[PDB]
């Protein structure tokens, strides 16, 4: 029959076959279930989509064409769930959130 | 000269799907590549531990769902679980 990618069957953009291969060759289990690559590819795609949409919103708010690392850092650090997920992660060319303690501000 | 096999094209497809007009730089592309690799490693390792604890030899969608619940905080886990369940249901119907 005609070849059909598993990503197309699951309706995803991320590669289900590549994820399956990485799971099999990654020393994680003796066997890998059929739906596990689909599930984890869907999860990865969802996380990527959420971060990219937030970064694109940040870039548009700065009236910029392209997402640069600063926009990714702004998207993650301004979301508490994303900050908790990436608490111990350093982003290259990311900078820091603009925050000044109220005590340092003059009267 | 060994076909580095990154995640760039899929992230770009997702970006063009969710923001049809904005682009992305090479540095941000590499950062998102690293992010996908890191989250893959975290979820896969935690699912491997889950299978080991319960004396199972195979990683199933149940293991991945539990790993997602244990690793993602708040509504992130809920929405990721919904996405994974919907994808697996669609794939089962072929």
């Amino acid at each position: 029959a005609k070849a059909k990618s598993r990503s197309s069957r699951a309706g995803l953009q991320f590669p289900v076959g590549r994820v399956h291969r990485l799971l099999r060759k990654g020393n994680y289990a003796e066997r890998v279930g059929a739906g596990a690559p689909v599930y984890m590819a869907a999860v990865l795609e969802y996380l990527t989509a959420e971060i990219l949409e937030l970064a694109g919103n940040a870039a548009r708010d700065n009236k910029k064409t392209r997402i640069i690392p600063r926009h990714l850092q702004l998207a993650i650090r301004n979301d508490e769930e994303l900050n908790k997920l990436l608490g111990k992660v350093t982003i290259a060319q990311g900078g820091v959130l603009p925050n000044i303690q109220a005590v340092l501000l003059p009267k | 000269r060994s076909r580095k096999e990154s995640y760039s094209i899929y992230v770009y497809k997702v970006l063009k799907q969710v923001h049809p007009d904005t682009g992305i730089s090479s540095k941000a592309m590499g950062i998102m590549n690293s992010f996908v690799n890191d989250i893959f490693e975290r979820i896969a390792g935690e699912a491997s531990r889950l299978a080991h604890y319960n004396k199972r030899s195979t990683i199933t969608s149940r293991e991945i769902q539990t790993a997602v619940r244990l690793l993602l905080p708040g509504e992130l886990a809920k929405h990721a679980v919904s996405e994974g369940t919907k994808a697996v249901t669609k794939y089962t119907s072929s």
Partner: single-chain antibody
Amino acid sequence: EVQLQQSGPELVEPGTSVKMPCKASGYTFTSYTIQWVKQTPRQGLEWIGYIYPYNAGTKYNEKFKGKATLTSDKSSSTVYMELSSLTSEDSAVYYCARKSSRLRSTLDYWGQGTSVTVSDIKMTQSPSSMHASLGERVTITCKASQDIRSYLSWYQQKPWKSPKTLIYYATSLADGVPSRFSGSGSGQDFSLTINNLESDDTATYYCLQHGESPYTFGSGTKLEIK
């Protein structure tokens, strides 16, 4: 478990300012933005703005800037909205609703509503009102002005009550809603279907979009049972 408490009705003369609380409990306070919605009988529901207690970030409706200011009190898990220069055209019920920072999420839980009285994307809900018996099919359409990538939610509001969420992300069932309710559609046309009706299901149904910065409700739909 999740509760958003509000204050009682306010009797305020024109020209002054009033502040109402949205004391919240039952969840991690800093993880959810608190959105404020006003409801007038002649313009339905209008989105005022939101506050993110994690970083005190705000975003107001362009038609409400200056008139309303939102403050976050992290210690008491309370959010206040301050309305200044109360004009005669401010007599309305003000709702405070919880919405997660995730784009897919919506205003899931609502406060009881603080009745204050003083002494762009357009949503089109095509069927204004309908009558049906205890077992038929009913469909409500929420044709949109621009496109929204399934960032549409369906709410049910019983009279003199806070709106209740039914569908979020245009297809996903809310928490605890029976599978009789079903939403569908994407892009600019969205639909809500009720499987089998009961005497309870008589209410007003609104469609909220949050795909763009000013959130806009639908015109409303009064459903009558038998």
